[PDB]
Design a protein around this ligand. Structure first.
Ligand SMILES: CCCCC/C=C\C/C=C\C/C=C\C/C=C\CCCC(=O)O
Ligand SMILES: [Mg+2]
Length: 387
């Protein structure tokens, strides 16, 4: 994907950069607003990281571990907030965009999972559209720093439970994301992953836990046929396994037609999408069995079955409401992502942790956490994966 000569030249172009530490300003997850500070050392001097830049979206590659960078942000911010939900990025100055930091692995690494790589849509996106929108979409007062929720997504909860770095290629389409970036498809995501990892040092793909949730963007936003979505899903698994991937967290798709935005869709539109989701889920199960029979490490979670339980009896799963958004949005219009919204009366009363949905499409961070924990329980804190 990148010649060996190009890799050497890039890796030898050594420099330094600074770290932007982001945090939730409120102690409540009802408030999505965030702010940032530069990372500092204990003596008050600026914290810097050594490494090299590369772009095919600039990634900064450093020898400094994600834990060390995280620790510097925690100490700099010195918040007594359990909901601080700290994230960090590389940045040369005040004008810089939020650049992902890749921590290079050691040459003598043990045979165990040491990072999470995510592929998918808005259900896994951690801010891929936010630099492209000049930090204006989704509005950072009502959506958590480029996440289409009031906090972390399921992949971040999974990565945190295992104390692992998470590197994200996921980006959706239900919020008008394609008015900001092109190349959002799963094949474009796998291509981008393959290109950027050639620049990494001592990269062993066998030590990566891959997460993949794909198909809802295609069925909801692009009216794509079931065979073309099945073919793209099979193609992603073929390309990843041929490039050394051994470990996957696969999942069935929740019935997206249960989301508040479908209150404003016709019955014909709803039945079309629902039928496509059901056919796709049978194919996802067949694909998981196919790779499991070949000796790959596959964890399959039935998110569809869990979501049916959650929406039919929310009171049995820690929720008061599964039909309305927490935010006071009572229509389906992508322009609403540009504005600040108040919480509806019922959600302000119960708290955002008691609602399944945050906006007309996306789940709350409590729903993301519930799914992530059910996943770890199902797989016995991921038993067929070596940690
Ligand atoms: C696979 C992990 C799921 C964790 C969240 C739990 C339940 C699903 C939540 C909501 C209902 C389903 C779909 C609508 C949500 C996002 C839009 C995805 C497509 C896009 O972005 O265009
Ligand atoms: Mg195809």
């Amino acid at each position: 994907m990148v010649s060996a000569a190009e890799v050497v030249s890039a890796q030898e172009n050594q420099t330094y950069t600074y770290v932007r530490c982001w945090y939730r300003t409120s102690h409540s997850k009802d408030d999505a607003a965030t702010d940032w500070k530069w990372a500092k050392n204990q003596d008050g001097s600026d914290f810097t990281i050594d490494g090299y830049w590369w772009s095919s979206k600039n990634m900064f590659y450093t020898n400094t571990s994600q834990n060390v960078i995280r620790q510097r942000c925690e100490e700099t911010l010195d918040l007594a907030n359990e909901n601080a939900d700290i994230t960090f990025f590389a940045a040369d100055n005040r004008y810089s965009y939020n650049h992902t930091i890749w921590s290079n692995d050691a040459a003598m690494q043990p045979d165990q999972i040491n990072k999470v790589v995510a592929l998918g849509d808005s259900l896994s996106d951690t801010g891929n559209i936010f630099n492209a929108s000049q930090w204006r979409f989704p509005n950072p007062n009502s959506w958590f720093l480029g996440h289409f929720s009031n906090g972390f997504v399921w992949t971040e909860y999974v990565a945190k439970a295992k104390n692992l770095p998470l590197y994200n290629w996921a980006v959706g389409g239900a919020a008008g994301e394609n008015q900001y970036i092109a190349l959002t498809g799963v094949g474009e995501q796998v291509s981008s992953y393959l290109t950027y990892t050639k620049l990494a040092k001592n990269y062993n793909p066998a030590n990566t836990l891959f997460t993949l949730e794909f198909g809802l963007n295609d069925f909801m936003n692009y009216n794509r046929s079931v065979p073309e979505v099945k073919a793209d899903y099979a193609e992603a698994l073929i390309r990843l396994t041929d490039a050394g991937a051994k470990n996957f967290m696969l999942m069935t798709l929740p019935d997206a037609t249960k989301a508040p935005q479908f209150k404003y869709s016709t019955q014909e539109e709803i039945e079309t999408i629902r039928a496509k989701v059901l056919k796709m889920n049978e194919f996802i199960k067949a694909q998981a069995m196919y790779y499991k029979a070949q000796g790959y490490n596959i964890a399959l979670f039935d998110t569809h079955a869990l979501f049916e339980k959650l929406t039919s009896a929310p009171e049995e799963h820690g929720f008061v409401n599964a039909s309305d958004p927490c935010l006071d949005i009572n229509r389906s219009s992508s322009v609403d992502y540009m504005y600040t919204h108040s919480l509806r009366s019922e959600c302000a009363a119960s708290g955002a942790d008691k609602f399944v949905f945050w906006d007309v499409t996306h789940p709350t961070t409590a729903t993301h956490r519930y799914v992530a924990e059910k996943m770890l329980e199902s797989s016995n804190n991921l038993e067929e994966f070596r940690f």
